[PDB]
Each structure stands twice: as C-alpha cells, then as structure tokens.
C-alpha cells in the first residue's frame, strides 16, 4: 500500500529543520539566543529536570536557569555546569529569574504536592505576554485540576500525552479525533503538542503531523528531553509554531537514528547529539 494522508495537515520532514534552524549572525551574543528558565524536579523526580536542562543547553539556548529542589543542584551541575540554579525556597530570586525569562518550561519531575501547586500558581500569575510558557507533565495535571484560566494563551504550549490531554480537554481517548482535538485546542487558544507514536501539533493554523518516533524511545526521560528541546528552540528561533514542530521533528529524527543501533535510546544521548545534527540543517 501507498501512504494515506489527511488533507489540511502538514506532514513533517527535514524540510522543517531547514526552515527553522538558521545560521547565527556573526554579530550575535548569548543574549540573542534567549534566557530560558526550566522549572521542575522535586525530591523524587529530580532527574527529569536534569534531562530537560541537558537538552536545553545542547539545543543552543543562550542562558539556562533551573528552578528545582536544592537537593538536585549537585547532580545537575555535575552533568550541566552551564546551567544556573535556584531553589524552590528562594521566593524572590525565583521570581526574578522568571521575570527575566524569554521562555519558561514548567513541569518535568515537578510532582503534584503543595509546593508544586504553589510554584505553578506563582508562574501562571507572573507570566508576561511576550514570554513563551511550556506546561508539561504534572504541571498539565495541576493546571487542569486547579481550574486556572490563561491570561495570555497564545504563547502557552501544552505538551500532554494522551491521558494528560484527556484531563485537560475532557476528551476521552476514544474521542480524541482530529476535529475534536482541534476544537479543544481552539477553546484554549494555546498550542497543543499531543505526544504519541506520531505526535501531532494543534494550533491556530493547519496542524503538523510528526512522521518519526519509535518504541526504543519509550523510556523515562524522553518527554523531559523533548520539552527541553522545545524550550531551547523557542529561545533562539522565530516565534511561530513551525519552531515547535522543528523541535518535535529533530527529537524523533535523532531518536530514530539512534534506535538503529540502540535497543533502548537513552534520552541523554538525544541531547548530546543536538549540536552535530543542528549544524547539518542550519539554513545557510
């Protein structure tokens, strides 16, 4: 059989990487490549945020700050000394770093407890119109349970797996059709990166359909890694949803390549491959 494609949907290929990944201007400094703040990693799940951090740094973000439990700062710096670190208890400093951010990612390893809830509320309250805000993992669950309302939804990006999306959209998985998914995207006014074997991105335009991904990537940290890549991309590249699609595509391209040799693809190997892959596509 030949493939079947849905009309009104953009199927992703290397084309998206050529479009999104631009050659850096010779007059650039690190501030031109964005300030990212990554928020997550409670005391049980600190490795999640460490994996997002490695992805963000390796994707080319200019400056990366991590708000995470102080417990996690040691191993984070052992792996990623490029990252700056702020503890959850550091109320004023964490507010300062969020205020300065170009991109905020909240959710990897964040958990569901009262501290997690408080930090999410502070971030949602503090969010500025021009800042990208990526809500991932347990932050989606808390968002849906806290009956919040988004002030500036147009630069919010949710990255749910199917059960997180059920919770956010109230669409049972059986009802998560292209039409229904799009309608529920429209109701939020935000971008939905609906993760699956073939991730789909819903937004104000024609949806993007990812064409990669493999079950060798079905391991803890793959999603944390993707979230970090998305954040690093939004930090550096044009503020359009194509940039998010480029991140999603590159994540699965690298993972698909690694799976050719690796039965399970360690998520940190995708991050470590970013600089060489991005160089190959950088639009000259």
């Amino acid at each position: 059989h030949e493939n079947l494609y849905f009309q009104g949907m953009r199927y992703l290929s290397k084309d998206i990487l050529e479009e999104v990944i631009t050659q850096r201007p010779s007059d650039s400094y690190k501030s031109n490549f964005g300030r990212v703040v990554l928020i997550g990693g409670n005391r049980q799940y600190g490795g999640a945020i460490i994996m997002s951090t490695e992805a963000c740094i390796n994707s080319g973000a200019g400056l990366t700050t991590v708000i995470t439990d102080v417990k996690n700062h040691g191993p984070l710096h052992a792996r990623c000394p490029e990252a700056m670190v702020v503890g959850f208890e550091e109320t004023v400093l964490l507010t300062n770093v969020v205020e300065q951010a170009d991109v905020i990612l909240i959710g990897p390893g964040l958990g569901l407890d009262a501290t997690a809830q408080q930090i999410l509320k502070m971030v949602l309250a503090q969010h500025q119109k021009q800042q990208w805000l990526i809500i991932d993992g347990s932050a989606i669950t808390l968002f849906s349970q806290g009956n919040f309302s988004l002030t500036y939804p147009e630069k919010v990006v949710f990255t749910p797996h199917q059960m997180e999306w059920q919770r956010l959209s109230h669409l049972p998985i059986e009802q998560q059709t292209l039409a229904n998914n799009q309608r529920q995207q429209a109701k939020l006014g935000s971008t939905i990166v609906l993760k699956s074997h073939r991730t789909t991105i819903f937004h104000a335009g024609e949806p993007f359909q990812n064409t990669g991904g493999n079950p060798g990537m079905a391991t803890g940290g793959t999603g944390d890694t993707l979230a970090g890549i998305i954040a690093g991309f939004l930090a550096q590249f044009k503020p359009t949803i194509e940039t998010i699609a480029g991140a999603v595509y590159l994540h699965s391209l690298i993972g698909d390549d690694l799976a050719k040799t690796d039965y399970v693809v360690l998520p940190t190997k995708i991050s470590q491959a970013l600089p060489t892959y991005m160089k190959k596509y950088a639009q000259p």
Copy 2:
C-alpha cells in the same frame, strides 16, 4: 574433560534470540515495566547505583530506586533517568513498591533493622503478578528471619555459594545438582546459583551458563547482573528463559570486553546493553 549432566541445558546465543523481542510500534514506557530497586546503605551505595545503570540500559521502562538519601546525588549524576525514594519516606516507599512490576532487593543493602523492616514490608505486600528478586544480604536476612513467600513461583534468589548455604542449609561440599534441585523445589522459587558457570534451578530442567571470566571478578559484577535480570523481567515473557537470557547476556558482554580489558568494569557491561540487545533482538 568437561562433565556433562544429561538433565542440564547449556546456554548459547539462541536464548537471546528467543527472549529479546522487537518492540511493538504502539508501545509506551509503561509497557516496558515499572522496576523498583531497593538497596544501597551508606557504605555500599555504589552497589545500587550499578544495579540502576544496568536496569535502565537493559530497557526497563521506568526505574525507581529506594536507597539512602546519601546516595541520591551520585545516582542522579550517573543515572538521571532513575527516580529516587529514601528509606525514611515510608508512605512513598510503600506506594512505589505497590505499583512495581518487578522489585529487586539486596544490592548494597546491608543487615540493619531498616533493611529488615523493608524486606518485611516487600514480602508482606508481594502480589502474584509481581516479580521479586532477592539478592545479596537480602538473602541472608530472608533466611535468618521468619520470612516466607506467598507467591514463591514469582520469586528469584540470586545467591553466591555462601548465601545459598545459608538459604538452603547445604554446605558447599553438599551443593550437588540433585541436592540443589531438591532445595529449589522446597522453596518453589527460581535459584540463580552464581559461580563460574552460573546455574539456574527452577521447576523445569536446570540451565547452565557457558560463559564468564575472571576479568569480571570485581566488586559490582553481581549488582550489574541483578539489574539486568530486573530489566529483563520488566519487559519480556514471565518465564525462566527470560532470566536465563539476562544471565547469558551479562557474561557474553563481559567475555567480549575481557578480550581487550584485563578487568571488566561492571558499568561497561551495562553501557553495552543497548547495542548488544539490538543485535540479538528477534526480528
């Protein structure tokens, strides 16, 4: 010359082709199992760190480590994929054990009262669908306490010879094929009896591993094996062939590394799992 026993089954690469399946296209991480690894007191925390690296690299979908909070930092520096729970975190520890598909207890665990209490809790809650691997000092604790098995057929012990002597009451001299088999039967569990040619006793005919080398005779080799067994049970068919494939792969990689390496660092075996498993994955 070799002495062969007619009832004995000799492992080869065939076991890997049988056990290691191609993953289905529609799989998600929960399909490849939730593993809980329990061990690593304040002296021996490296042991659980080595088991964890083996488990993650073997392809387990999710890995949580219950170990002294002292060890959480170095563990995450090496293995950020792992989730971590301290020995003091009683409610959380209980929850993660309850949710696990495979529980490994023992690497670096030591012999203290906290170790006995967690073993007690794990054994009390053991569910029929869960695999429980009891390794190292946890075997000593099990044998010395009045601990019993509700579902022995889902329990795997991984003793060295002195641990088997404690568990089976067979002195090393008396550890013959027939006597070993008889004491397995009495337990109703799988016994991975570690030696130069590790032998696996179970309800069927015993398996003997044909590999292994003294370049692997270094601290951590057994902790590594235990993590591979855990990861294999998390992903593959619930049969003793799955356990045999873990044992065989561990020594295959070790034997290959020993061709170039005088001593084989146990973490190198773990690091080679993804490439070896791809090679043998039943296509």
Copy 3:
C-alpha cells in the same frame, strides 16, 4: 571591507608557537604554577566549575578553588584534580591566596558582601610577583568600591562591554581604540576587552583576536577563557603575549569545534586543550 588600524597587531597561530614552550625534562608540578580560582556563589557555581576545568586542562600545575561549599561536590565529580576551599574558611582561604602564583577572581562570584570582602582581601595582599585576573562581577565590585591596585602591571581585567563601561566610565559609543587605550593607561593594567574580535590593551601596541564565532555565544564561554588565561600565566612567560596566546587558543578551538557543532559547549573547548597545546608546543 575590514578596517585596519596601523597600531593594531592581529593574532595568528604564530602567537601559540611563541608562547607554548616544551616543558623541561626536570620539571615538577610547582614549576607549572599554583593557581587560585575564586568564584561560584550558590546560584552561579557552574561558572567556577567551568573555569576550573579550563585551568586544569591548560596545564596549570596545581589548582585550588575558593567557592561556596555547595559547589565542592559537583566540582570534584568533574575535576578531582582541583583542591577546594569554602568562603567561610577564612584562615585557609588567606593562606592559599598568599601562596598562589596566579589568582583569578570573578566567574559566578555575584555581588554580595562576602564577595566584596574576599575581593578586598585579595587586593590588599596582592604581591608583585603574582598575576591577578579580575573577571565578571569582580570588575563591577572593583569599580563600585574604593578598591585600588598596588601593582597594576600584574593585574588583568577581562570585561565585556558593559563591565568596561563601568570600569573605564566610557559609554559603549565612546569605546574607541584611542579612548580604550587612554583608560588602560590610567589603570596601568592589561584590559582584555571581550567582543566578537576581542582586543587586548596594554603598555604596548594592542592585539586583536581574529577568531571567534556565534556558536560560542553560550553561558560559560567567558568562564572558560578566564581559566585558560589563568593557566597560561601560571606556566608561561610573564608578558602580554602569554595572555594573547590564551585568547587566541580559546577561539581557535572554538572555531574548529563550530565546524561540526552548532553550539560549542564551553567544556569541550577545555577538554581539547591538551591535544591542541601539544600540536603548537614550540619544539
């Protein structure tokens, strides 16, 4: 087209052949200098960790890091060669500074009272034979306080443009070759004025670096440079050519890595130092 200034000297590989000497057969580690690196508060500890890796890989004989005790663990995980002293350890800190051949203060240092007190102590004790490199926030602190230089000719400042504006009082618009040179003269120190083409102002004719690329425009690149400068001054002739060679090598490695790497991790530059330096070592 390029604009050339007749008084300006353009760096090339010749500077490396001049600076990087073959080590004498009878050398010991103290011959390659004692470096003290001072920085890394609780938010920015990675910065001092990156300077330390650069310093060690550059060939400094002994490296001690004065940084918050929070940072000592990850630093040793990455750089076990480094010795570590906390900010609170006042007698020991004073001793290591006294014994140093080269002192670098600033990477990740922040602006708090402890940072001001240590800067004060370093400046007060500065010995004529010691090199002192003042980097990052330490430049801000120096300029805002009533700090002065007893031996300015052994002091190197490494400002970005806004730090130079604070130190020299020249707004960016006014930062011309002539004005920059005049404010160097007023200080009597070496100014490594970081930009796309870093320019070094000193008592002689200025040097301009000819390399550098936006793949290096990431957090840590400057912390790395500062460690290379420190290591070079610890080992090589006490002249401004030594500083120029550090600047040039840093960007040579970065420019080479950028051929394959979209962003150049600063730690990769550090890791490449031993192989690059061997290649250029004046035979």
Copy 4:
C-alpha cells in the same frame, strides 16, 4: 653518546610487566584479587583520594574501600561506584575495614591536621604483619614528625618525593646518593619508592631504576594515581618488590604514551587506560 648505567641496579622495561602481570586463573573470584583500603582525602583535598580510588579499581583490585571525609563520598561514587565508603568519624567501621584489608594505602589528600594524625596512629597501631601498608604524601610527613616506629616494616612501602624523603631519611637532597639512599632504606627496613623524573625503588635487593616519566605528568594527582596503582598491584600479584616496580613502570609507560598526544596528561586518563594496557602484558 651511548647510555651510562650503574652496576648493581635493575633498569626497568616492559620485561617487568610481563613478569608481574599474570593471567588470572579461571577458577578465581573477587576475593582472590585482594581487599584494598585507601585512606585520605580531607575536606580540602578529597580529589586526591578519588584519583587513587579510580587507579585502584581500574588496576584490577578485587574490592576497594575508601576511608575519607563523608564530604567526599558523593563525588567519589559519581566517578567510581565500585568503591565502598567509610567516613573518618566511623571509628568502629573504619577499624573493621582496615582489619580485613590485604593492602592499606594511607596519605593521598590526607592533610596534616589532628584528625589526620589520629587516623595515621590508629592505622599504624592496627597494622598486621601480613598486610601491605603504603605510606604516601602527608602521611610520610606525619610519620616523620610523630617519631613513630614500625612494628612490621618489611611490608611497609613509602612513596616520597625528594623533600618528603629528606624529612623521612634526614638526607638533604644534595646527599641523596644511591649509597646514602640505600643505607637509609636499610635503617627503616621498608621499601622506598623515591619518586622523581626517574623514580628509583630501594629495598632489600638490588634497586630498580625506572626508565620512563615526562614533564606532561607534572600535574596534581599524578602521585595519587601511582599510589592507587601500587595498591591494586600489591592486592593481586606476588608479594615481592618486583610487583611495586611493575606498578611504577606501567604508570610512567602509560603517561609517556599519552604525552605523545597530550601537552598535560590528566592523571585520571592513566587510570582509565589500565585495563587495556594490562591485557597487553598479561603473561600468558
């Protein structure tokens, strides 16, 4: 010019590696490869003991335990999870591990303070005739200042650089002649590994003269690394001074090889090369 050699002195070559590094018997277990205890690393100098630990593990020691400040246990396990760890405060446990050891190394990063002094005295008091005891670095200085006397000197190995040897032997560097060095070795009844550009080993037999070493190795940690190799060798191989000479030779062979490509030879690179080098010489 052709070389000049001293009569009554064995000049080392790969021959020593073939002699010392034996093929392991197929019936071996980890206990056959010795229990080593490494003691050092105060709060300032913890990296020293971490470097000795990596050398010891990579050299093939069966089991390695480190008695070091608890501060150091995290980074030690991040690099060397094979090692077991005991804090200086753990009086009973540290005594237990020393009692069981086949080889004790004391001194890398140990420092000179009261805790260092106490631990050295405990170890010297506890030493058993059959145990190898390597006294390195600041432990040599403390040994010389504490006017100690060795109970079983024949299995003590001192590893001084020239100024440490001046302190131990009272020979000014000018007076450190072959004859004088040997006489002062004889007075102690111990092995002296007198480290230099061309390390010399004095003992009850003809001295060994190392023929390698280079100034690319003149960096902090080189000596800590050597001490760990010596300890791992004594753990596994025949209890003769040739074993110590083999360790010293291999350390400089690897360092000399690495210096061909590396301006400075990171000491941890020597350790990481041990398994491949030892395989090449293992006497079949």
